[PDB]
PDB file of C-alpha atoms and ligand atoms in Angstrom:
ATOM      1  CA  UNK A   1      -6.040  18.086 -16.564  1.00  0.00           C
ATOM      2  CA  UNK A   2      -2.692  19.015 -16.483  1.00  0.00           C
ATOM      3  CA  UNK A   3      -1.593  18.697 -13.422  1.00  0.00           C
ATOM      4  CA  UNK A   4       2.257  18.057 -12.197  1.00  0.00           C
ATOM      5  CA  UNK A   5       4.630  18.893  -9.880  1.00  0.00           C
ATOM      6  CA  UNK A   6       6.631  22.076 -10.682  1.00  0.00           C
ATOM      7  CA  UNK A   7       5.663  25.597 -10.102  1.00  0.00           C
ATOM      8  CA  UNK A   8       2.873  26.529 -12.615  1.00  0.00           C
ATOM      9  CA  UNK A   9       1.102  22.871 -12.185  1.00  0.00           C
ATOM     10  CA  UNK A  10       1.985  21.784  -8.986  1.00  0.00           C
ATOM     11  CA  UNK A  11       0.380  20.680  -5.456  1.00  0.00           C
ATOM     12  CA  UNK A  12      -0.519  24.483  -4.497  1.00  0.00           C
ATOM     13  CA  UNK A  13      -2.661  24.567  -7.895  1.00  0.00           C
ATOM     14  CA  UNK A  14      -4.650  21.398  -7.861  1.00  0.00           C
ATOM     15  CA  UNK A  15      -7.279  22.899  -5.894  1.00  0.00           C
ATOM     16  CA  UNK A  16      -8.301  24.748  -8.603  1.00  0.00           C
ATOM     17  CA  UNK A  17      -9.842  22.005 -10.757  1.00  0.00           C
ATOM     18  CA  UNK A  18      -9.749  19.656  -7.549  1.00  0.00           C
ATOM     19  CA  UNK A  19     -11.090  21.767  -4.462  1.00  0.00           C
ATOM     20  CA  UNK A  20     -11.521  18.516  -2.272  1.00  0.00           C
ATOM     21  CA  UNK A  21      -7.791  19.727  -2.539  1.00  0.00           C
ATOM     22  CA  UNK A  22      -8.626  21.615   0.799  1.00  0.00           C
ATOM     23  CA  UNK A  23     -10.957  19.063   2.421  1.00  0.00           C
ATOM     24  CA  UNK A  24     -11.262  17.120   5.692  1.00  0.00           C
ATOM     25  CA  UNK A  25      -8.988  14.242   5.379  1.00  0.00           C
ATOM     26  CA  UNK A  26      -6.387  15.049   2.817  1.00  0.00           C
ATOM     27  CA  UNK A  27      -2.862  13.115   2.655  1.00  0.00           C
ATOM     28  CA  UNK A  28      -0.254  13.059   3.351  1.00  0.00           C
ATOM     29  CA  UNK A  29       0.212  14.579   6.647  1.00  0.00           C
ATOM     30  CA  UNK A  30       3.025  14.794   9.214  1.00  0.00           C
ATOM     31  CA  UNK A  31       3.093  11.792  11.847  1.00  0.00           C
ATOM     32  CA  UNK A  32       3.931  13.552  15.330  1.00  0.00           C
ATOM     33  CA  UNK A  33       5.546  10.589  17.284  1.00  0.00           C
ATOM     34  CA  UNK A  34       4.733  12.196  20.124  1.00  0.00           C
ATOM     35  CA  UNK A  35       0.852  12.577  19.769  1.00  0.00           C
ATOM     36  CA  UNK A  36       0.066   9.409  17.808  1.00  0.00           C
ATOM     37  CA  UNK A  37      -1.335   7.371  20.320  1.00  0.00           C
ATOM     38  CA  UNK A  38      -0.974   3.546  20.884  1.00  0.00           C
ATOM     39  CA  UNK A  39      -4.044   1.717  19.699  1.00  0.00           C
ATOM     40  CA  UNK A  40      -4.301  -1.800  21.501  1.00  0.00           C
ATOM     41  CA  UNK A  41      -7.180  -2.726  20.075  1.00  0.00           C
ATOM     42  CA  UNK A  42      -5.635  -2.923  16.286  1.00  0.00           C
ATOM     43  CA  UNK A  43      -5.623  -6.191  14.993  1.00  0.00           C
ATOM     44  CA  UNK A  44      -2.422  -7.514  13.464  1.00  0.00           C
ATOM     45  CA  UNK A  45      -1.325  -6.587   9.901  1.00  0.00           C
ATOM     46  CA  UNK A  46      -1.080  -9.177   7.568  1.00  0.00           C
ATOM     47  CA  UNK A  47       0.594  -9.027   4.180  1.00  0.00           C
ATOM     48  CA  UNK A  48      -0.034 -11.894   2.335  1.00  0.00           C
ATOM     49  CA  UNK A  49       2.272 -11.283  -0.999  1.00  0.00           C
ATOM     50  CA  UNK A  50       3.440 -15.131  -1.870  1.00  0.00           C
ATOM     51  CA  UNK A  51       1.011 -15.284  -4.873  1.00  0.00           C
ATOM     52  CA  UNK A  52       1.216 -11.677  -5.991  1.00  0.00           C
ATOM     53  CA  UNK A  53       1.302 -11.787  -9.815  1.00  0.00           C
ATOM     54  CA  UNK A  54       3.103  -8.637 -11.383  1.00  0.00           C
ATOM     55  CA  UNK A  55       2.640  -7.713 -14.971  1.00  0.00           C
ATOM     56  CA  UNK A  56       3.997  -4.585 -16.093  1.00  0.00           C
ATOM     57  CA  UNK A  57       5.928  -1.337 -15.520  1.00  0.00           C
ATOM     58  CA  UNK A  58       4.289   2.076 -17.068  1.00  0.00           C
ATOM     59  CA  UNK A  59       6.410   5.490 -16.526  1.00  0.00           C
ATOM     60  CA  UNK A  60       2.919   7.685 -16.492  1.00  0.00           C
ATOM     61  CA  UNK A  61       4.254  10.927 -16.418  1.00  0.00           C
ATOM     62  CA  UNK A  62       4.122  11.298 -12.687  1.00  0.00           C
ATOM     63  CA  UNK A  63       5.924   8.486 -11.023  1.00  0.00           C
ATOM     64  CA  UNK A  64       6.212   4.341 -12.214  1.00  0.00           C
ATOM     65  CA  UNK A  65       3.884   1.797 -11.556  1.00  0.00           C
ATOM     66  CA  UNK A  66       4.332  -1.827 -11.051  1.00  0.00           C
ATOM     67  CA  UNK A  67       1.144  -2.948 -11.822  1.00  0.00           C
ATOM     68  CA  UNK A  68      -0.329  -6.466 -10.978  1.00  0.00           C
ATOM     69  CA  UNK A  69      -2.490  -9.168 -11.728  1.00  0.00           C
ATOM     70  CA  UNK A  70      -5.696  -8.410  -9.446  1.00  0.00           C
ATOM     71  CA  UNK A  71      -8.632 -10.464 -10.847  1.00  0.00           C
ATOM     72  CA  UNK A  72      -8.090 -12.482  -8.134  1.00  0.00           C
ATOM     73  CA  UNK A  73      -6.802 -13.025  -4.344  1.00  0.00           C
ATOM     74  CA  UNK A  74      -3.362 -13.142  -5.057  1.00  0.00           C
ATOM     75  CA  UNK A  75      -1.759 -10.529  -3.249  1.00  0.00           C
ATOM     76  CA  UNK A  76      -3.722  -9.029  -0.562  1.00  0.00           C
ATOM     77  CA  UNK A  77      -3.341  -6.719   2.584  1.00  0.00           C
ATOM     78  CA  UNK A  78      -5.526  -8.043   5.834  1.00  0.00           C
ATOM     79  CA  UNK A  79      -5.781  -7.067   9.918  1.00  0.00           C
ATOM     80  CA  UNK A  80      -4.280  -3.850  11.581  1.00  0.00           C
ATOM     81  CA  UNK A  81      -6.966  -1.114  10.833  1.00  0.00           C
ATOM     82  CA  UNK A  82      -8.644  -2.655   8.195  1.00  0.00           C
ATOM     83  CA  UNK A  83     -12.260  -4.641   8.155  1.00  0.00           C
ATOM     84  CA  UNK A  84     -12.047  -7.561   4.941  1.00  0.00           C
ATOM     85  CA  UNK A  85      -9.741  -7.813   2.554  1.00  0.00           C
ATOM     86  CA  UNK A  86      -7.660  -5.453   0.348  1.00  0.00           C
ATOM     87  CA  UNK A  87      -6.392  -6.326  -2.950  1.00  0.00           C
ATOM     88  CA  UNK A  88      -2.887  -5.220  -4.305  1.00  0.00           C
ATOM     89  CA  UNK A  89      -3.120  -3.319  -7.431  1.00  0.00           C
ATOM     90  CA  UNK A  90       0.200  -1.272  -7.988  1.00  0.00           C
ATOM     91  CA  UNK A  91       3.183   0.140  -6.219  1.00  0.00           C
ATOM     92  CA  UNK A  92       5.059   3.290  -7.149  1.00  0.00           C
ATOM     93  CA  UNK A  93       7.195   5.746  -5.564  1.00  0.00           C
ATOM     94  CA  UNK A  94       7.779   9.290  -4.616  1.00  0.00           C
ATOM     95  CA  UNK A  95      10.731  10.906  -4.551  1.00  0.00           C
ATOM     96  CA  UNK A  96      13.176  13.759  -4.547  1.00  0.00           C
ATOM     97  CA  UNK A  97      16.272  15.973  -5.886  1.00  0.00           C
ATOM     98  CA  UNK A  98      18.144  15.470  -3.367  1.00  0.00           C
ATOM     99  CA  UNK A  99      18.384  12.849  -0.490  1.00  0.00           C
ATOM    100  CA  UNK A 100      17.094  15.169   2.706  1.00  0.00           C
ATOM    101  CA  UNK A 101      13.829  15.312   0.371  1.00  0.00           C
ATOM    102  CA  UNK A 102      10.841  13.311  -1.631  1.00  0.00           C
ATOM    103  CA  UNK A 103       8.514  11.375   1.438  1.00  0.00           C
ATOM    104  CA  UNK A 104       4.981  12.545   1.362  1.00  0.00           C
ATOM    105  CA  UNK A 105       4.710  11.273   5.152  1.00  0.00           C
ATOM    106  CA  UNK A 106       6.633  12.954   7.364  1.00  0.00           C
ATOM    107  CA  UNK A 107       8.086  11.941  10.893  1.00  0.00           C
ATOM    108  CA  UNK A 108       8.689  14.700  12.776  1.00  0.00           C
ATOM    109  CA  UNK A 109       8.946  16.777  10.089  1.00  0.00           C
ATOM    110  CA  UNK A 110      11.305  14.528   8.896  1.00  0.00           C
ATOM    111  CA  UNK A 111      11.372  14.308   5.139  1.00  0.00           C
ATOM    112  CA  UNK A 112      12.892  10.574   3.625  1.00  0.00           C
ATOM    113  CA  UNK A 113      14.605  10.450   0.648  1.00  0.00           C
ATOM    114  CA  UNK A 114      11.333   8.370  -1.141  1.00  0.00           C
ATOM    115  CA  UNK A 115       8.105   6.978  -0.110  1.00  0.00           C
ATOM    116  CA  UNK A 116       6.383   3.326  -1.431  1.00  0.00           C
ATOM    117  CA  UNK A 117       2.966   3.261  -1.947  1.00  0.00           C
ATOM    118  CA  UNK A 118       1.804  -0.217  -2.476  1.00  0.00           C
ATOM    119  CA  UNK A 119      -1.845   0.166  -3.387  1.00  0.00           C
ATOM    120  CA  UNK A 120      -4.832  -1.706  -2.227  1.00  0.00           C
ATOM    121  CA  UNK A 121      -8.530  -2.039  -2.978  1.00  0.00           C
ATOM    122  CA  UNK A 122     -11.580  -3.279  -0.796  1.00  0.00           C
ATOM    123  CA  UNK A 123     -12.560  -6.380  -2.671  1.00  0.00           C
ATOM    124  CA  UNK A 124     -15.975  -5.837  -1.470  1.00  0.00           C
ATOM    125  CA  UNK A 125     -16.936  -2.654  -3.680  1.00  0.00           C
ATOM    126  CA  UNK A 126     -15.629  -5.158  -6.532  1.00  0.00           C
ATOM    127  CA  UNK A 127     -13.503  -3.207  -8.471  1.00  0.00           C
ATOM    128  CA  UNK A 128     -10.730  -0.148  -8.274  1.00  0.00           C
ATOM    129  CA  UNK A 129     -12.969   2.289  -9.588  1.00  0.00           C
ATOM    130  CA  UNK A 130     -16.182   1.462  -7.549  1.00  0.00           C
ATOM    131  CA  UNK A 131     -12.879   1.683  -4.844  1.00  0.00           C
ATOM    132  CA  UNK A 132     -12.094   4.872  -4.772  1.00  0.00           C
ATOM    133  CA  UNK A 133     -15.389   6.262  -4.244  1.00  0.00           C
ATOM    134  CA  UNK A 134     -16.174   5.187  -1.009  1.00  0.00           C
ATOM    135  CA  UNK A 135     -14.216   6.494   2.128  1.00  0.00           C
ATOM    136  CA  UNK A 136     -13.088   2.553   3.117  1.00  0.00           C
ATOM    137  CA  UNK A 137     -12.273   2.096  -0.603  1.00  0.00           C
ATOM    138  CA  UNK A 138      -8.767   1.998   0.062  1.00  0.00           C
ATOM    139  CA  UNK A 139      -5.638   0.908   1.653  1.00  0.00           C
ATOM    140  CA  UNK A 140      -2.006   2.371   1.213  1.00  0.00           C
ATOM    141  CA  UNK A 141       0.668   0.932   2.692  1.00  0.00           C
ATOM    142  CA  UNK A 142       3.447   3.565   3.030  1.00  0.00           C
ATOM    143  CA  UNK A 143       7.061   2.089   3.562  1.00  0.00           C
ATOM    144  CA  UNK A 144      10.036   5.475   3.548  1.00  0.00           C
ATOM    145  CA  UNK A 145      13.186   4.981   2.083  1.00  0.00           C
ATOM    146  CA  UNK A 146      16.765   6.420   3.308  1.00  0.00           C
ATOM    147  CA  UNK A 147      19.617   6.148   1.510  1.00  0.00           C
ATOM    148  CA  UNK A 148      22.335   4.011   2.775  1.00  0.00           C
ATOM    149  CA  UNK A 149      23.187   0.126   1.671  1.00  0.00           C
ATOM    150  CA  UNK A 150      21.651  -1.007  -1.415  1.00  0.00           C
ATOM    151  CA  UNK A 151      17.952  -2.830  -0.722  1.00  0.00           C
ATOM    152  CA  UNK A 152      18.599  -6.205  -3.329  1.00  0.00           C
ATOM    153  CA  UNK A 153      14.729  -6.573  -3.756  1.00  0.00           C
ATOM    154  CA  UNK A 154      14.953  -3.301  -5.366  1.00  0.00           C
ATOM    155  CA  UNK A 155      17.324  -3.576  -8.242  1.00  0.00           C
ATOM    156  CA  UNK A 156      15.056  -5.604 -10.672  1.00  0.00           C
ATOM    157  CA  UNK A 157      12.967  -2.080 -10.583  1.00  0.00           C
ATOM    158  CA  UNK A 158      16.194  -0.178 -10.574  1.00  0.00           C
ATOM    159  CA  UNK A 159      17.452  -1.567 -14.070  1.00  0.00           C
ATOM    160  CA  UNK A 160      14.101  -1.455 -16.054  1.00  0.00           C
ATOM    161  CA  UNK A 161      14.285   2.417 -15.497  1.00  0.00           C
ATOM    162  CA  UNK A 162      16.561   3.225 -18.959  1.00  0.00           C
ATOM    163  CA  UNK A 163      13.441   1.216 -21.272  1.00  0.00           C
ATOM    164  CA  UNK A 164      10.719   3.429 -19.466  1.00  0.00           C
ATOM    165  CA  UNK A 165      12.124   6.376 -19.277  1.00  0.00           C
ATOM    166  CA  UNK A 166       9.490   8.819 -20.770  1.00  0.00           C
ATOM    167  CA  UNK A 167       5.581   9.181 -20.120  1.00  0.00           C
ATOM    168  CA  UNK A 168       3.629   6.558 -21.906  1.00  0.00           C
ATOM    169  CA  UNK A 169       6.145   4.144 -21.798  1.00  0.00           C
ATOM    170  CA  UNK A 170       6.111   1.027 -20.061  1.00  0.00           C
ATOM    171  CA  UNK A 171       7.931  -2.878 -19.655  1.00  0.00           C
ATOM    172  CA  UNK A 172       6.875  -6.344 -19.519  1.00  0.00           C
ATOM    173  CA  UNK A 173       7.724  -6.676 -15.970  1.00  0.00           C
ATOM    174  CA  UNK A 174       6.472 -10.637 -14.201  1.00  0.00           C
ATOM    175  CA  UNK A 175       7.641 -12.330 -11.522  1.00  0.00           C
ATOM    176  CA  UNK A 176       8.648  -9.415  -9.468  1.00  0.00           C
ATOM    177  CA  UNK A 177       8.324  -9.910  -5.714  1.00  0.00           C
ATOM    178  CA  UNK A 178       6.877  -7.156  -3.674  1.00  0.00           C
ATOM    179  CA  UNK A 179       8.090  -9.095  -0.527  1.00  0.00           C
ATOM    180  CA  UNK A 180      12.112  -7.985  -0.746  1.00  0.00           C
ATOM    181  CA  UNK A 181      10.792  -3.995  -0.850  1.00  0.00           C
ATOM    182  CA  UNK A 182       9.100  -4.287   2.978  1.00  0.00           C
ATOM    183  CA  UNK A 183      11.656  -3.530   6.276  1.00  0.00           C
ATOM    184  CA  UNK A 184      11.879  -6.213   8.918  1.00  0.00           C
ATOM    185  CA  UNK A 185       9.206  -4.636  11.163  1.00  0.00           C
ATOM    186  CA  UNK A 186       6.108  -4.298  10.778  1.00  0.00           C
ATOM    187  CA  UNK A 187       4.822  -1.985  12.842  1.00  0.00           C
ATOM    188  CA  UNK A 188       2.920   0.940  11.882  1.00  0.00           C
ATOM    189  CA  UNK A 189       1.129   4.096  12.184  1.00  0.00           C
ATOM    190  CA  UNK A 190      -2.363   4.612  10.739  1.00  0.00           C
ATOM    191  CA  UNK A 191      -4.925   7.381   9.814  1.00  0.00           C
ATOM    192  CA  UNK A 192      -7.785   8.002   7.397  1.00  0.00           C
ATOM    193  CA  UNK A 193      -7.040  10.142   4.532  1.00  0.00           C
ATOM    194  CA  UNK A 194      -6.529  10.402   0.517  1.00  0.00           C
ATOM    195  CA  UNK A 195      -5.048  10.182  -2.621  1.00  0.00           C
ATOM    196  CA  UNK A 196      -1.937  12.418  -2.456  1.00  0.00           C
ATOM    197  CA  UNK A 197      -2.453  13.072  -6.079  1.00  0.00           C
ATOM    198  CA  UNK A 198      -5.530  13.931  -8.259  1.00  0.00           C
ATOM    199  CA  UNK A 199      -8.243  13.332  -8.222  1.00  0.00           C
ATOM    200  CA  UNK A 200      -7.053  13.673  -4.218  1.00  0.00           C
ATOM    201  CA  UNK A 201      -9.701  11.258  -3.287  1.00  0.00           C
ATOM    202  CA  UNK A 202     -10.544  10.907   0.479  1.00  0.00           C
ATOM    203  CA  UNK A 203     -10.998   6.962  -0.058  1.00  0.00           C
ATOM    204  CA  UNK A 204      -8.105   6.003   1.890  1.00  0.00           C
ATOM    205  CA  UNK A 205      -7.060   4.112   5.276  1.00  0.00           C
ATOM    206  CA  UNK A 206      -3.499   5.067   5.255  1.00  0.00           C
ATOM    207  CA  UNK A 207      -1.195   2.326   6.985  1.00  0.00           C
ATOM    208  CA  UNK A 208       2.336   4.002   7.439  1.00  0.00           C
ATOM    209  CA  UNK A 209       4.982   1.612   8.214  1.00  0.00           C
ATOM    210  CA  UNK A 210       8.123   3.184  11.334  1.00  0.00           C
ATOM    211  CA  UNK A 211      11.006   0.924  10.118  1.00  0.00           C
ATOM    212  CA  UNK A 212      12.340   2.495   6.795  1.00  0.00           C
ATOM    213  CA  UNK A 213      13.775   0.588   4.440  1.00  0.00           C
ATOM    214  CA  UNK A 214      17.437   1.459   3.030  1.00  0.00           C
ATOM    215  CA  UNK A 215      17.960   1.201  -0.420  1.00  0.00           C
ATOM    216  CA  UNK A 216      21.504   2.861  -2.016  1.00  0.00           C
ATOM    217  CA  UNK A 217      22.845   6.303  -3.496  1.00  0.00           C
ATOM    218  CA  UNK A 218      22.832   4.651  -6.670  1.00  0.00           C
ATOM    219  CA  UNK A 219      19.580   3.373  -6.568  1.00  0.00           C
ATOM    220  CA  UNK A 220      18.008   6.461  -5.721  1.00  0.00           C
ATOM    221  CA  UNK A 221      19.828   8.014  -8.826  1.00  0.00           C
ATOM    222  CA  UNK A 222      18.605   5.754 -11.035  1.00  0.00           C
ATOM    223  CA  UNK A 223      14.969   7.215 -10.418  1.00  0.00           C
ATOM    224  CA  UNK A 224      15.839  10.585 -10.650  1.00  0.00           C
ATOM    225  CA  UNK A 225      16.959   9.711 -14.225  1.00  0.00           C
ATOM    226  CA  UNK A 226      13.639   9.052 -15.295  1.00  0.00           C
ATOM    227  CA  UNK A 227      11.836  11.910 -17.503  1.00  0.00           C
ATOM    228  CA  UNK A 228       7.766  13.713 -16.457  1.00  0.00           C
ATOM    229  CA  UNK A 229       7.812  14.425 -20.558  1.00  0.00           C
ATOM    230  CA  UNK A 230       7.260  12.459 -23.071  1.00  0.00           C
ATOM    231  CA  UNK A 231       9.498  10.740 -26.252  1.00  0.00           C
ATOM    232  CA  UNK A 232      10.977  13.648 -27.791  1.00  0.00           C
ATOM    233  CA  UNK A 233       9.937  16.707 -25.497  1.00  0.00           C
ATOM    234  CA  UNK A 234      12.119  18.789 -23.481  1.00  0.00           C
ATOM    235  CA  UNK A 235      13.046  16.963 -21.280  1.00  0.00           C
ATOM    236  CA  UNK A 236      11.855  17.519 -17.431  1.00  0.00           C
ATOM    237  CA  UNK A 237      13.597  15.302 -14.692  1.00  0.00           C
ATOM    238  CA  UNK A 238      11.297  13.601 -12.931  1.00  0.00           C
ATOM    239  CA  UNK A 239      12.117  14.308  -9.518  1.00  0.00           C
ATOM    240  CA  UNK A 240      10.408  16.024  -6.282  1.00  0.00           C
ATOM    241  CA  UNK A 241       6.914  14.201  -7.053  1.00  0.00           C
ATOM    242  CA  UNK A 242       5.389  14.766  -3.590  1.00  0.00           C
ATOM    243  CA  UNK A 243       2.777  16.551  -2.083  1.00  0.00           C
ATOM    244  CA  UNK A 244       3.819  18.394   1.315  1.00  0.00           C
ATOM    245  CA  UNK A 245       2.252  17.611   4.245  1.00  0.00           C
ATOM    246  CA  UNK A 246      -1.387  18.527   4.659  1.00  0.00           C
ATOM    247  CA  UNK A 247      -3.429  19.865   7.939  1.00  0.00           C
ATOM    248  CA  UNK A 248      -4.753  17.238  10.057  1.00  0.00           C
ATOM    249  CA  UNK A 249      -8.010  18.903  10.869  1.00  0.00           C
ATOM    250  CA  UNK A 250     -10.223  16.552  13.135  1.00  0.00           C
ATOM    251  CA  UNK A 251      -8.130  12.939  12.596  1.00  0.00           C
ATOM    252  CA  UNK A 252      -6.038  10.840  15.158  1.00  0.00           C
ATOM    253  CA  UNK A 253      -2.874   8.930  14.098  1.00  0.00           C
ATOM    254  CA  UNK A 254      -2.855   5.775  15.712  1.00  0.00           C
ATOM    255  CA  UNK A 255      -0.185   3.294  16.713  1.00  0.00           C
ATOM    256  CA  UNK A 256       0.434  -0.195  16.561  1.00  0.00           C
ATOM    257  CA  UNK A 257       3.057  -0.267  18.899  1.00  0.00           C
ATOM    258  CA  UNK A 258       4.347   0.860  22.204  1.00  0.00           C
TER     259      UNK A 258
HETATM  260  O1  7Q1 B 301      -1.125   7.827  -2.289  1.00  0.00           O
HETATM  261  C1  7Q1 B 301      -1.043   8.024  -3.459  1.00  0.00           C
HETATM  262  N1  7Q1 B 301      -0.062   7.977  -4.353  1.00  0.00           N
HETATM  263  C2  7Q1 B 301      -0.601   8.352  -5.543  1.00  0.00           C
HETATM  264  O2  7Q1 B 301       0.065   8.461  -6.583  1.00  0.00           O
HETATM  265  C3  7Q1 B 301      -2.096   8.638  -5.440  1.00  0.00           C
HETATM  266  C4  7Q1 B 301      -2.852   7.667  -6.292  1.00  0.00           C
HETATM  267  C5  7Q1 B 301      -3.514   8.089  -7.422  1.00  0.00           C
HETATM  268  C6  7Q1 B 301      -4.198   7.180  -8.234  1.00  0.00           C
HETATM  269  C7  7Q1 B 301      -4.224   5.840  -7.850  1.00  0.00           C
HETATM  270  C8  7Q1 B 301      -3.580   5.424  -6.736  1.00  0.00           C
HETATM  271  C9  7Q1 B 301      -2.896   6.289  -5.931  1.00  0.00           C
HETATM  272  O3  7Q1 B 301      -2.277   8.459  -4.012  1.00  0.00           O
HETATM  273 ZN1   ZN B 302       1.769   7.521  -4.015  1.00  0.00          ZN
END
């Protein structure tokens, strides 16, 4: 598989060797504010992050993951849509050339500047892989990003960018804390859908959160500095690593709030 974003590889391709590309509950989609409905009956979300153990950064040629330490409980996602208990595995972003572009969600039609994904898996299917098979597998917790003041949580991320900068490469990166990259609010829209890359698995309960967070000009530069090749290949800026929005086909967004 080589699959990427740009125009001979990217998100208009994947069907070919992925044709769940063009299924039922593909991601991401555009959130209509206006038709999502209020959902009183949703539980409240609960992100439990105080004993979240991060290990490692990896540039995989697509985006950066901070990975973590899930053998255990340690950092897990609870409530709002979900039934059990959802273990943090890794967070990464999407993002793109410029700041009116590089969310995968979309508000409005509204694109964000980036999109976190901090990744979760159903503890009781026992492991990621087992995961992503079944269609409660999942849970995604979607936060967008504008550019404005600098978000602090985010710098520790920002500066390990220069020693990753090429596919393959990754950081010794502990003792991050996942709790300084979520907004005040928590309230959220939700939906079931997929993967928003290959293998574009429809294993997901998708929990998007309204309040964006801001995070600065510089910061966002810092991540477009980052390289889709490898060591000592041409080099490709890795940039504009979202899918566009997908149809909606028979789901309902729901809202946590009023
Ligand atoms: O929502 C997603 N962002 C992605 O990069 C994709 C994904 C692929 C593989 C593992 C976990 C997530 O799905
Ligand atoms: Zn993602």
């Amino acid at each position: 598989h080589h699959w990427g974003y740009g125009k001979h590889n990217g998100p208009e391709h994947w069907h070919k060797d992925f044709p769940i590309a063009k299924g039922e509950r593909q991601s991401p989609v555009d959130i209509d504010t206006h038709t999502a409905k209020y959902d009183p009956s949703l539980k409240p979300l609960s992100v439990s992050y105080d004993q979240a153990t991060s290990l490692r950064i990896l540039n995989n040629g697509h985006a950066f993951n901070v990975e973590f330490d899930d053998s255990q409980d340690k950092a897990v996602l609870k409530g709002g849509p979900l039934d059990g208990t959802y273990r943090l595995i890794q967070f990464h972003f999407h993002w793109g050339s410029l700041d009116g572009q590089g969310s995968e969600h979309t508000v409005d039609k509204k694109k964000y500047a980036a999109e976190l994904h901090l990744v979760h898996w159903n503890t009781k299917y026992g492991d990621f892989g087992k995961a992503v098979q079944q269609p409660d597998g999942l849970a995604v917790l979607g936060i967008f990003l504008k550019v404005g003041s600098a978000k602090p949580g985010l710098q520790k991320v920002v500066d390990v960018l220069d020693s990753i900068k090429t596919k393959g490469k990754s950081a010794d990166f502990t003792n991050f804390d996942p709790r300084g990259l979520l907004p005040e609010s928590l309230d959220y829209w939700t939906y079931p859908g997929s993967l928003t890359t290959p293998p574009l698995l429809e294993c997901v309960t998708w929990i998007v959160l309204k309040e964006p967070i801001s995070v600065s000009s510089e910061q966002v530069l810092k991540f477009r500095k980052l390289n889709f090749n490898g060591e000592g290949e041409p080099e490709e800026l890795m940039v504009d690593n979202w899918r566009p929005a997908q149809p909606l086909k028979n789901r309902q967004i729901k809202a946590s709030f009023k």
